[PDB]
Amino acid sequence: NPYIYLGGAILAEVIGTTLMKFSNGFTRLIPSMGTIICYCASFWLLAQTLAYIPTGIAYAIWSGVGIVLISLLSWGFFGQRLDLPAIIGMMLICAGVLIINLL
Amino acid sequence: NPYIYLGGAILAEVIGTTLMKFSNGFTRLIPSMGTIICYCASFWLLAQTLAYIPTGIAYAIWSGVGIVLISLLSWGFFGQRLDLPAIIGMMLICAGVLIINLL
Amino acid sequence: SSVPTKLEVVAATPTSLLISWDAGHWWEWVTYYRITYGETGGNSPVQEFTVPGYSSTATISGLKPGVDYTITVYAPTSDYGSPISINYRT
Amino acid sequence: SVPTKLEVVAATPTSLLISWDAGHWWEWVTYYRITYGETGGNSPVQEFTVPGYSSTATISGLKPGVDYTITVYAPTSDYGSPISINYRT
């Protein structure tokens, strides 16, 4: 059950980040409001999950699925790819996150 | 230039999370204020560094340098060293940053 | 094709002016408008204040009666459009 | 632990200026709540809040001669038990 609130908080933060690209530096009303609401939602869901699920597991799933979600939404709204050498470097950081979290 | 503000938002965020751990239930005034200022600064810094760097590309370096500085400042002078055979994973994160940083 | 529009003086007063404007569509709503008012025969600077972007009206006080003033309403950045400015004699 | 030393600095038959040691920097709370009511309680009491950086607070709209009970609470009971005193205007 708490793994579902985690992914929802992930998606909420993913939506919040994508809505921030629409805020133009917090200068457009409604995108700026959407980011505040989405982050407060991810805050509340994450706090409800940390009472059960361990922290290192939560961040690992967060950063992994989060990197995938906002990279696919950044590509679905204003697409791009290996602007600089590596997209594999993105997932390389993701792997570097997963080790010092799980291991 | 944009990676300077990205690392600055990373630093501002890490300071905010640490001050939140020092603060209690958002009740100790000074650290709670610091968290608010830090999160305000970080979100404004990340918003203005998002128009230059791709979203998913910024997401990785954000999470990566974050936990690098988190585990660094943790082991630094507020305890901790645990999971020691994982500094290689810190070098993995730095490797992923470099192959995405101005190269 | 910009924000804002229809800068008009709702209510007047020898010392105060209540103004409003067309904030545009929901995607056109900004987070803060800054308002600038001063003597139209400017001898001195322009008093400015900001106001949240969810309100279309704003009140200005402390004006000298009989004097004509310029009032300009700006956007957070110049990307939304040129600021609208009008004149009014209290 | 905090707050500490709740005493009435100034005293008018209808008003009491109280103060307390707000602590010391890294132990300042965000806010205190100050409750003042009749020492017996006709039906209610009275209460307000004050930001944490402030160490003084005034209490107005009182009745002369009546003995009141004034209590100051931390944001939570984690900082310690609330401090309560008495005073007759």
Coordinates of C-alpha atoms in Angstrom, one line a residue:
Chain A
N1 CA 0.0 0.0 0.0
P2 CA 2.7 2.6 0.9
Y3 CA 4.5 1.9 -2.4
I4 CA 1.4 3.3 -4.2
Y5 CA 1.6 6.6 -2.3
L6 CA 5.3 6.7 -3.2
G7 CA 4.8 6.4 -6.9
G8 CA 2.0 9.0 -6.6
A9 CA 4.3 11.4 -4.9
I10 CA 6.8 10.7 -7.6
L11 CA 4.3 11.4 -10.3
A12 CA 3.1 14.5 -8.3
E13 CA 6.7 15.8 -8.2
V14 CA 7.1 14.9 -11.9
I15 CA 3.9 16.9 -12.8
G16 CA 5.1 19.7 -10.5
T17 CA 8.5 19.9 -12.3
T18 CA 6.9 19.9 -15.7
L19 CA 4.5 22.6 -14.6
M20 CA 7.4 24.7 -13.4
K21 CA 8.9 24.8 -16.9
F22 CA 5.6 26.5 -17.8
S23 CA 5.8 29.1 -15.0
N24 CA 8.5 31.2 -16.7
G25 CA 10.4 31.8 -13.4
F26 CA 7.2 31.8 -11.3
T27 CA 5.8 34.6 -13.3
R28 CA 2.8 32.8 -14.8
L29 CA -0.2 32.4 -12.4
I30 CA -1.6 28.8 -12.4
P31 CA 1.6 27.0 -13.4
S32 CA 3.2 28.5 -10.3
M33 CA 0.1 27.5 -8.3
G34 CA 0.2 24.0 -9.8
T35 CA 3.8 23.5 -8.8
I36 CA 3.1 24.5 -5.2
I37 CA 0.1 22.2 -5.0
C38 CA 1.9 19.3 -6.6
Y39 CA 4.9 19.6 -4.3
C40 CA 2.7 19.9 -1.2
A41 CA 1.0 16.7 -2.4
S42 CA 4.3 14.9 -2.9
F43 CA 5.3 16.2 0.6
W44 CA 2.2 14.8 2.2
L45 CA 2.4 11.4 0.4
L46 CA 6.1 11.0 1.1
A47 CA 5.6 11.8 4.8
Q48 CA 2.8 9.1 4.9
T49 CA 5.1 6.6 3.3
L50 CA 8.2 7.1 5.5
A51 CA 6.2 5.9 8.5
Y52 CA 6.4 2.4 6.9
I53 CA 8.8 2.1 3.9
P54 CA 12.5 2.6 4.6
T55 CA 14.0 5.8 3.4
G56 CA 16.8 4.5 1.2
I57 CA 14.4 2.3 -0.8
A58 CA 12.0 5.2 -1.2
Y59 CA 14.7 7.6 -2.7
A60 CA 16.0 4.9 -5.0
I61 CA 12.6 4.2 -6.5
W62 CA 12.0 8.0 -6.5
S63 CA 15.1 9.0 -8.3
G64 CA 14.9 6.1 -10.8
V65 CA 11.3 6.4 -11.8
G66 CA 11.5 10.2 -11.4
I67 CA 14.4 10.5 -13.8
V68 CA 12.5 8.3 -16.3
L69 CA 9.2 10.2 -15.9
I70 CA 10.4 13.8 -16.3
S71 CA 12.9 12.8 -19.0
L72 CA 10.0 11.3 -21.0
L73 CA 7.8 14.3 -20.2
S74 CA 10.6 16.8 -21.1
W75 CA 10.8 14.8 -24.4
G76 CA 7.0 14.7 -24.9
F77 CA 6.6 18.5 -24.5
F78 CA 9.9 20.1 -25.6
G79 CA 11.9 17.1 -26.8
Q80 CA 15.7 16.6 -26.8
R81 CA 18.2 13.8 -26.4
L82 CA 22.0 13.6 -26.0
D83 CA 22.5 17.3 -26.1
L84 CA 25.8 16.6 -24.3
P85 CA 27.7 13.3 -24.9
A86 CA 25.5 10.9 -23.0
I87 CA 21.9 10.0 -22.2
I88 CA 23.6 6.9 -20.7
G89 CA 25.3 9.3 -18.3
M90 CA 21.8 10.2 -17.0
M91 CA 21.1 6.6 -16.2
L92 CA 24.8 6.3 -15.1
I93 CA 24.1 8.9 -12.4
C94 CA 20.9 6.9 -11.7
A95 CA 23.0 3.8 -11.2
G96 CA 25.4 5.8 -9.1
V97 CA 22.4 6.8 -7.0
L98 CA 21.2 3.2 -6.6
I99 CA 24.5 1.9 -5.2
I100 CA 25.1 4.4 -2.4
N101 CA 21.5 4.0 -1.5
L102 CA 20.9 0.2 -1.6
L103 CA 24.5 -1.0 -1.2
Chain B
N1 CA 27.1 29.2 -16.2
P2 CA 23.9 27.1 -16.0
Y3 CA 25.7 24.3 -14.1
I4 CA 26.9 26.9 -11.6
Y5 CA 23.3 27.8 -10.7
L6 CA 22.3 24.1 -10.7
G7 CA 25.0 23.3 -8.1
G8 CA 23.9 26.4 -6.2
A9 CA 20.4 25.1 -6.0
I10 CA 21.8 21.7 -5.0
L11 CA 23.7 23.4 -2.2
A12 CA 20.7 25.5 -1.2
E13 CA 18.5 22.5 -1.0
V14 CA 21.0 20.4 1.0
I15 CA 21.3 23.2 3.5
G16 CA 17.5 23.3 3.7
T17 CA 17.1 19.6 4.4
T18 CA 19.8 19.7 7.0
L19 CA 18.3 22.7 8.8
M20 CA 14.9 20.9 8.7
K21 CA 16.5 17.9 10.5
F22 CA 18.0 20.3 13.1
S23 CA 14.7 22.1 13.5
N24 CA 11.9 20.2 15.1
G25 CA 8.3 20.2 13.8
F26 CA 9.0 23.4 11.9
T27 CA 8.9 25.0 15.4
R28 CA 12.4 26.2 16.1
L29 CA 12.2 29.6 14.4
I30 CA 15.7 30.2 13.0
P31 CA 16.3 26.8 11.3
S32 CA 12.8 26.7 10.0
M33 CA 13.3 30.2 8.5
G34 CA 16.5 28.9 7.0
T35 CA 14.7 26.0 5.4
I36 CA 12.1 28.3 3.9
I37 CA 14.7 30.7 2.5
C38 CA 16.7 27.8 1.2
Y39 CA 13.7 26.1 -0.5
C40 CA 12.6 29.5 -1.9
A41 CA 16.1 30.1 -3.3
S42 CA 16.5 26.5 -4.6
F43 CA 13.2 26.5 -6.4
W44 CA 13.9 29.9 -7.9
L45 CA 17.4 28.8 -8.8
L46 CA 16.3 25.6 -10.4
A47 CA 13.5 27.3 -12.3
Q48 CA 15.9 29.8 -13.9
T49 CA 18.4 27.1 -14.6
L50 CA 15.8 24.9 -16.2
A51 CA 15.4 27.0 -19.4
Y52 CA 19.0 26.3 -20.4
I53 CA 19.6 22.7 -19.4
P54 CA 17.1 20.0 -20.4
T55 CA 14.7 18.9 -17.7
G56 CA 15.7 15.3 -17.4
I57 CA 19.4 16.3 -17.8
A58 CA 19.0 18.7 -14.9
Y59 CA 17.1 16.1 -12.9
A60 CA 20.1 13.7 -12.9
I61 CA 22.8 16.2 -11.9
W62 CA 20.3 17.5 -9.3
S63 CA 19.8 14.2 -7.6
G64 CA 23.4 13.1 -8.1
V65 CA 25.4 16.1 -6.7
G66 CA 22.7 16.3 -4.0
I67 CA 23.3 13.0 -2.4
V68 CA 27.0 13.5 -3.0
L69 CA 26.9 16.6 -0.9
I70 CA 24.4 15.0 1.5
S71 CA 26.7 12.0 2.3
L72 CA 29.7 14.4 2.2
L73 CA 28.2 16.9 4.7
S74 CA 26.9 13.9 6.7
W75 CA 30.3 12.3 7.1
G76 CA 31.8 15.8 7.2
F77 CA 31.0 16.9 10.7
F78 CA 27.5 15.7 11.7
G79 CA 28.4 12.0 12.1
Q80 CA 28.3 9.1 9.8
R81 CA 30.5 7.1 7.4
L82 CA 28.4 4.0 7.0
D83 CA 28.2 1.8 3.8
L84 CA 31.9 2.9 3.3
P85 CA 32.5 0.6 0.2
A86 CA 30.3 2.8 -1.9
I87 CA 32.6 5.9 -2.4
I88 CA 33.0 4.2 -5.8
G89 CA 29.4 5.0 -6.3
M90 CA 30.2 8.6 -5.5
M91 CA 32.8 8.4 -8.2
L92 CA 30.1 7.0 -10.5
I93 CA 27.9 10.0 -9.9
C94 CA 30.8 12.4 -10.6
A95 CA 31.5 10.3 -13.7
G96 CA 27.9 10.7 -14.9
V97 CA 28.1 14.4 -14.1
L98 CA 31.3 14.9 -16.1
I99 CA 30.0 13.1 -19.3
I100 CA 27.0 15.4 -19.1
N101 CA 28.8 18.5 -17.9
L102 CA 30.4 21.0 -20.4
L103 CA 32.3 18.4 -22.4
Chain C
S1 CA -2.0 40.2 -28.4
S2 CA -0.5 40.8 -25.0
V3 CA -1.2 41.3 -21.2
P4 CA -2.7 43.4 -19.8
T5 CA -5.5 45.4 -21.5
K6 CA -8.2 47.9 -20.8
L7 CA -6.5 50.1 -18.2
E8 CA -9.4 52.2 -16.9
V9 CA -10.1 54.2 -13.8
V10 CA -13.1 52.6 -12.0
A11 CA -13.5 55.2 -9.2
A12 CA -11.9 58.6 -8.7
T13 CA -11.2 60.9 -5.8
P14 CA -9.2 64.1 -5.3
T15 CA -6.6 62.1 -3.4
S16 CA -7.2 58.5 -4.5
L17 CA -7.9 56.4 -7.7
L18 CA -9.3 52.9 -8.1
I19 CA -8.2 51.3 -11.3
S20 CA -8.5 48.0 -13.1
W21 CA -7.4 46.1 -16.2
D22 CA -8.1 43.0 -18.3
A23 CA -5.7 40.3 -17.0
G24 CA -6.3 38.2 -20.1
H25 CA -6.8 34.5 -20.3
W26 CA -5.9 32.0 -17.6
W27 CA -2.7 31.0 -19.4
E28 CA -2.0 34.8 -19.7
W29 CA -2.4 35.4 -15.9
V30 CA 0.9 36.5 -14.3
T31 CA 2.0 36.0 -10.7
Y32 CA 2.5 39.8 -10.0
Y33 CA 1.7 43.1 -11.6
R34 CA 3.8 46.1 -10.7
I35 CA 2.0 49.5 -10.9
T36 CA 3.7 52.8 -11.5
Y37 CA 2.2 56.2 -10.9
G38 CA 3.5 59.7 -10.8
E39 CA 3.0 63.3 -11.9
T40 CA 2.4 63.5 -15.6
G41 CA 4.5 66.7 -15.9
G42 CA 7.2 64.7 -14.1
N43 CA 9.4 66.7 -11.8
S44 CA 10.1 63.8 -9.5
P45 CA 10.4 59.9 -9.7
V46 CA 7.6 57.4 -10.2
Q47 CA 6.2 55.7 -7.1
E48 CA 5.7 52.0 -7.9
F49 CA 4.2 49.1 -6.0
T50 CA 3.6 45.4 -6.8
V51 CA 0.3 43.5 -6.4
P52 CA -0.5 39.8 -6.7
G53 CA -1.3 38.5 -10.1
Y54 CA -4.7 37.0 -9.1
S55 CA -6.3 40.5 -8.7
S56 CA -7.3 42.8 -11.5
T57 CA -8.0 45.9 -9.4
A58 CA -5.7 48.1 -7.4
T59 CA -6.2 51.3 -5.3
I60 CA -3.8 54.2 -5.2
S61 CA -3.9 56.8 -2.4
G62 CA -2.0 59.9 -1.3
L63 CA -2.5 61.9 -4.5
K64 CA -2.6 65.7 -4.7
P65 CA -5.9 67.0 -6.0
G66 CA -6.2 68.9 -9.3
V67 CA -2.9 67.4 -10.5
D68 CA -2.8 65.2 -13.6
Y69 CA -1.1 61.8 -13.1
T70 CA 0.3 59.0 -15.3
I71 CA -0.4 55.4 -14.2
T72 CA 1.3 52.5 -15.9
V73 CA 0.8 48.8 -15.2
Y74 CA 3.6 46.4 -16.0
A75 CA 4.2 42.7 -16.3
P76 CA 6.9 40.5 -14.5
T77 CA 8.9 40.5 -17.7
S78 CA 8.7 42.3 -21.1
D79 CA 7.7 38.9 -22.7
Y80 CA 4.0 39.2 -21.9
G81 CA 3.7 42.5 -23.7
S82 CA 4.2 46.3 -23.5
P83 CA 2.9 47.9 -20.3
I84 CA -0.4 49.9 -20.6
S85 CA -0.3 53.5 -19.4
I86 CA -3.1 56.1 -19.1
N87 CA -3.6 59.6 -17.7
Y88 CA -6.1 61.0 -15.3
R89 CA -6.7 64.4 -13.6
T90 CA -7.9 64.0 -10.0
Chain D
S1 CA 13.2 24.3 29.1
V2 CA 11.5 27.1 27.2
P3 CA 9.9 29.5 27.9
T4 CA 11.4 30.6 31.2
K5 CA 11.0 33.4 33.8
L6 CA 7.4 34.7 33.1
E7 CA 7.0 37.9 35.1
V8 CA 4.8 41.0 34.9
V9 CA 6.9 44.0 34.1
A10 CA 4.2 46.7 34.1
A11 CA 0.8 46.6 35.7
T12 CA -2.2 48.9 35.2
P13 CA -5.6 48.0 36.8
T14 CA -6.8 47.0 33.3
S15 CA -3.6 45.9 31.6
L16 CA -0.5 43.8 32.3
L17 CA 2.8 44.0 30.4
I18 CA 4.5 40.6 30.8
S19 CA 7.9 39.3 29.6
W20 CA 9.8 36.0 29.4
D21 CA 13.2 34.7 28.5
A22 CA 12.6 33.6 24.9
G23 CA 15.6 31.3 25.1
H24 CA 18.7 31.9 23.1
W25 CA 19.0 31.9 19.3
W26 CA 19.3 28.3 18.3
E27 CA 16.5 27.5 20.8
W28 CA 14.1 30.2 19.7
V29 CA 10.7 28.7 18.9
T30 CA 8.5 30.0 16.0
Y31 CA 5.7 31.3 18.3
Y32 CA 4.4 31.3 21.8
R33 CA 0.7 31.4 22.8
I34 CA -0.3 33.4 25.9
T35 CA -3.4 32.5 27.8
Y36 CA -5.0 34.9 30.4
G37 CA -8.2 34.2 32.2
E38 CA -9.9 34.7 35.5
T39 CA -8.4 32.7 38.4
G40 CA -11.8 31.1 38.9
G41 CA -13.3 31.3 35.4
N42 CA -16.7 32.9 34.9
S43 CA -17.1 31.0 31.6
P44 CA -14.1 31.4 29.3
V45 CA -10.5 32.7 29.4
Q46 CA -8.5 34.7 26.9
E47 CA -5.6 33.8 24.7
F48 CA -3.4 35.1 21.8
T49 CA -0.2 34.2 20.0
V50 CA 3.2 36.1 19.7
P51 CA 6.1 35.5 17.2
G52 CA 9.1 33.6 18.6
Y53 CA 11.6 36.4 18.3
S54 CA 9.6 38.6 20.7
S55 CA 10.1 38.2 24.4
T56 CA 7.4 40.6 25.7
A57 CA 3.6 40.8 25.4
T58 CA 0.9 43.1 26.6
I59 CA -2.5 42.0 27.9
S60 CA -5.3 44.6 27.7
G61 CA -9.0 44.7 28.4
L62 CA -8.9 43.4 32.0
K63 CA -11.0 44.1 35.1
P64 CA -9.4 46.0 38.1
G65 CA -8.9 44.0 41.3
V66 CA -9.5 40.6 39.7
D67 CA -6.8 38.0 40.0
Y68 CA -5.8 36.5 36.6
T69 CA -3.9 33.4 35.6
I70 CA -1.4 33.9 32.7
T71 CA 0.1 30.9 31.0
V72 CA 2.6 30.8 28.1
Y73 CA 2.8 27.7 25.9
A74 CA 5.5 26.6 23.5
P75 CA 4.4 25.5 20.0
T76 CA 4.5 21.9 21.3
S77 CA 4.9 20.3 24.7
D78 CA 8.3 19.0 23.6
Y79 CA 10.1 22.1 24.7
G80 CA 8.8 21.6 28.3
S81 CA 5.7 22.3 30.4
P82 CA 4.0 25.6 29.9
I83 CA 4.8 28.3 32.5
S84 CA 1.8 29.8 34.4
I85 CA 1.7 32.6 37.0
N86 CA -0.9 34.7 38.8
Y87 CA -1.3 38.5 39.3
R88 CA -3.9 40.8 40.9
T89 CA -4.3 44.1 39.0

